């Protein structure tokens, strides 16, 4: 890979279900904190979960994040989805100054029939 971090450009989930986002990153950022961010403007977004630069799973409210530092992928899970969860999110790597970030648009809808 060339860009520091990439993920799904757009994902769609449904009320009460879940969805999973794979944030792939280049090996150089192995030992950096990974995080999942919400909202725009981009760099004032609300951090929902953040790792301690390890592979330990972190869960906060309905959001989990686990860094695979062998395959260089940190996976994010949003459970028990609500309509209010729709919006713009960010795969993130913490560093001094401007973080590497990839925009993930999350659509949420009701379960049809």
């Amino acid at each position: 890979m060339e860009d520091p971090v990439t993920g799904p450009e757009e994902v769609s989930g449904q009320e009460q279900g879940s969805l999973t986002v794979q944030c792939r990153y280049t090996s150089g950022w192995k030992d950096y904190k990974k995080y999942w961010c919400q909202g725009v403007p981009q760099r004032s977004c609300k951090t929902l979960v953040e790792t301690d630069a390890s592979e330990q799973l972190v869960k906060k409210n309905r959001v989990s994040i686990r860094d695979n530092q062998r395959d260089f992928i940190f996976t994010v899970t949003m459970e028990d989805l609500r309509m209010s969860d729709a919006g713009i999110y960010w795969c993130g790597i913490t560093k001094g100054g401007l973080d590497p970030m990839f925009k993930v648009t999350v659509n949420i809808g009701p379960v049809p029939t």
Partner: protein, 303 residues
């Protein structure tokens, strides 16, 4: 002894965003004690916060710019801040260099850039810069360092040099102070106030060039005094004799008295207003000094 410039508000310059004053209003539903850092001045001429003398410094900054390309981000600018007259910026008893934006959101800025690409030399590049309220960019204008970036597939081959960033647009505006020091507290001018019961802040309003993907509503920004008044007091350095000045806002051609108000020595004007909704005023009047009055002077209510 104190007098004011004979200039209608609509012909004055806004003190927090570089644009004309367009509105004059009170609105009890807005924050009653804003902690604005520009447009802050004492009636004795003392500049507060980051207030500059020149209106052209408002919401701008000067810097030594250093550029570099980062894949996934674009051309990244590290701005080592200076004062806008070229003198060194030294962190001290204010939040940032004079005139630095005192609001939040994502700001488009424009700077002179020089490139090394053949067939090209000078041009103006638009950068994006997150101001606040909180950011993951570690903005620290108090320490003299801020970061900005512009999308780009490859390096713009920019030459490091001096710049003055001027504001192009605001995105996600919030009238709360920006990230001055990576989340740490900085020296700030205190919130505007206090007010007597029934008193509300008089607001001089302009509108900010905006990026908004869904809504066409104009982005309002208020300040306590137009820039002409800021420069007026800074220059005259009047001797203060009480707590506040009784002003009359009057139409110069009809003599009609529109309202009386109190210009507190700390640099803000209060009106007595009991309503709950906003009340706008004509912008073609003239403020005139009546006399000194104490803080407890009770104004005649408006509307």
């Amino acid at each position: 002894m104190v007098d004011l410039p004979v200039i209608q508000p609509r012909l004055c310059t806004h003190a927090r965003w570089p644009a004309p004053v367009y509105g004059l209003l009170v609105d009890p539903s807005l924050p009653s004690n804003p902690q604005w850092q520009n447009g802050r001045v004492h009636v004795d001429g003392t500049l507060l916060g980051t207030t500059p003398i020149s209106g052209s410094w408002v919401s701008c900054f000067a810097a030594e710019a250093a550029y570099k390309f980062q894949s996934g981000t674009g051309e990244v600018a590290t701005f080592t801040l200076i004062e806008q007259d070229g003198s060194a910026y030294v962190p001290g008893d204010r939040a940032a260099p004079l005139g630095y934006p005192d609001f939040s959101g994502q700001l488009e800025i424009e700077v002179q850039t020089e490139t090394t690409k053949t067939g090209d030399k000078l041009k103006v590049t638009t950068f994006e810069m997150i101001l606040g309220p909180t950011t993951n960019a570690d903005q620290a204008p108090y320490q003299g360092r801020v970061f900005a970036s512009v999308t780009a597939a490859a390096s713009l081959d920019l030459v490091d040099g001096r710049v003055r960033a001027v504001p192009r647009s605001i995105y996600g505006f919030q009238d709360t102070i920006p990230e001055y020091n990576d989340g740490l507290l900085v020296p700030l001018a205190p919130p505007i106030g206090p007010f007597l019961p029934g008193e509300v802040l008089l607001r001089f309003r302009t509108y900010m060039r905006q990026i908004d993907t869904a809504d066409a509503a104009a982005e309002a920004i208020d300040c306590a005094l137009p820039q002409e008044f800021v420069s007026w007091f800074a220059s005259n350095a009047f001797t203060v004799q009480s707590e506040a000045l009784l002003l009359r806002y009057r139409n110069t051609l009809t003599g009609q008295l529109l309202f009386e108000c109190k210009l507190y020595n700390e640099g803000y004007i209060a009106l007595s207003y009991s309503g709950s909704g906003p009340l706008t005023f004509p912008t073609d009047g003239i403020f005139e000094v009546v006399s000194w009055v104490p803080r407890l002077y009770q104004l005649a209510s408006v509307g």
